[PDB]
């Protein structure tokens, strides 16, 4: 009687605190470790929410509760399909693991020498500003590592889950020997 | 017997789906509406997680479970105090409501004419790039609305929850009559 209550509450207390943690610190801009915990919680949350609605539809309070449970069941299923479609289509255009981050669907692809570095774009703009400070690149407010201003890519790819856009370098200014600025516009 | 199970499960099914929604779409870069739902969920999650641990400490499985519950109770309380301290200190330096967003603790303050517009900074850098395109301002990859390039602030404030930084305009270039670029560095 009381023992079953205690095991029930203890397990749920752990889960609710875990949801609070991933809801407060589960962001790649805060802690990459907590972000992966949130993603594992969200991956488990889709079928659990669906399966919980399947239960409330098999054992409902009334007919309206049975229908609502089925609507919520499809809702959990539709959100997972939607997430998988966007993340897959983004991953095929980028190959980066930021494609699976629901928080960001705009990705900036910049080729630095051999490989291409992908970073999430917060604001989808028609223009992106490149700033090389003494040999260190900063694209659209976020750093991209070391790169020579002369070896700046003439084209930069932005990847949304439904379209891949290319940005050609319109303007190019050099502040120093390796310091400079450049702009990119779509077409 | 079975009826209590049905009402209990139906309520939790709604809650778990709501957590899934706010965990998947609760971001200001996706939907401002879903973001506020997440914040209401998180504000309710702190005392609920604490109160649930208080229960498992009053009615524990064993002595170790009683101690763990008390540790989680203080953990839920410490995270809320931490969030409130950062958000308040940020709100006093900025006055913006983005200070209460746990996802962002770096805020960019740019004075556009009469008032000052604040936007969250993803990457805390020592430099911030200003780009005015035909009379539209873009600071660090995100737009700030209409502004004249001539009317660009000589100083821009960055506000972290523990320090307020000022950025003086080092370089200034004009691409056109109202189009131009500028950079800001801290001190
Ligand atoms: C930037 C650093 C700021 C300070 C960091 C503080 C670190 C957090 O401190 C928390 C320690 O406080 C102890 C809280 O006490 C826990 C209460 O537990 C009750 C035990 O119940 C068991 C009963 O059998
Ligand atoms: C930024 C760091 C700020 C640190 C602040 C930490 C504050 C933590 O508060 C600790 C208080 O929480 C302890 C909760 O324990 C109470 C449980 O009560 C159990 C009593 O059992 C009665 C038995 O009948």
Numbering used by the authors:
A (entry chain B), B (entry chain A): 13 to 199
Sentences from the paper on this structure:
After extensive crystallization trials and refinement, batCOV5-M crystallized in lipidic cubic phase (LCP) and the crystals diffracted to ∼3 Å resolution. The final batCOV5-M model was determined to 3.21 Å (batCOV5-Mxtal) and contained residues 13–199 of batCOV5-M, and the amino-terminus (12 residues) and the carboxy-terminus (21 residues) were not modeled due to weak electron densities. The batCOV5-Mxtal structure is organized as a homodimer, with each protomer containing a short amino-terminus, a three-helix transmembrane domain (TMD) and a cytosolic CTD consisting of an eight-stranded β-sandwich. The overall shape of the batCOV5-Mxtal dimer looks like a pair of pincers, with TMD as the “handle” and CTD as the “head” of the pincers. The two protomers form extensive TMD–TMD and CTD–CTD contacts with a buried area of ∼3,100 Å2 at the dimer interface, which accounts for ∼25% of the solvent-accessible surface area of each protomer, suggesting that the batCOV5-Mxtal dimer is a stable form. In the batCOV5-Mxtal structure, TM1 is placed almost in the sample plane as TM2/TM3, and the three helices of TMD resemble a capital letter “N,” while in SARS2-MAF the TMD helices form a more compact three-helix bundle. As a result, using TM2/TM3 as anchors, TM1 swings ∼40 degrees away from TM2 and CTD undergoes a rigid-body rotation of ∼30 degrees away from TMD during a transition from the “short” SARS2-MEM to the “long” batCOV5-Mxtal. Structural alignment yielded an all-Cα RMSD of 1.8 Å between batCOV5-Mxtal and SARS2-M-FabEM-long and an all-Cα RMSD of 1.6 Å between SARS2-MEM and SARS2-M-FabEM-short, while the major deviation came from flexible loops of these proteins. This result indicates that the structural organization is highly conserved in betacoronavirus M proteins, and the batCOV5-Mxtal structure represents the long conformation of M protein. In the second pattern, the N3C helix binds to a groove formed along the CTD dimer interface nearly vertical to the membrane plane.
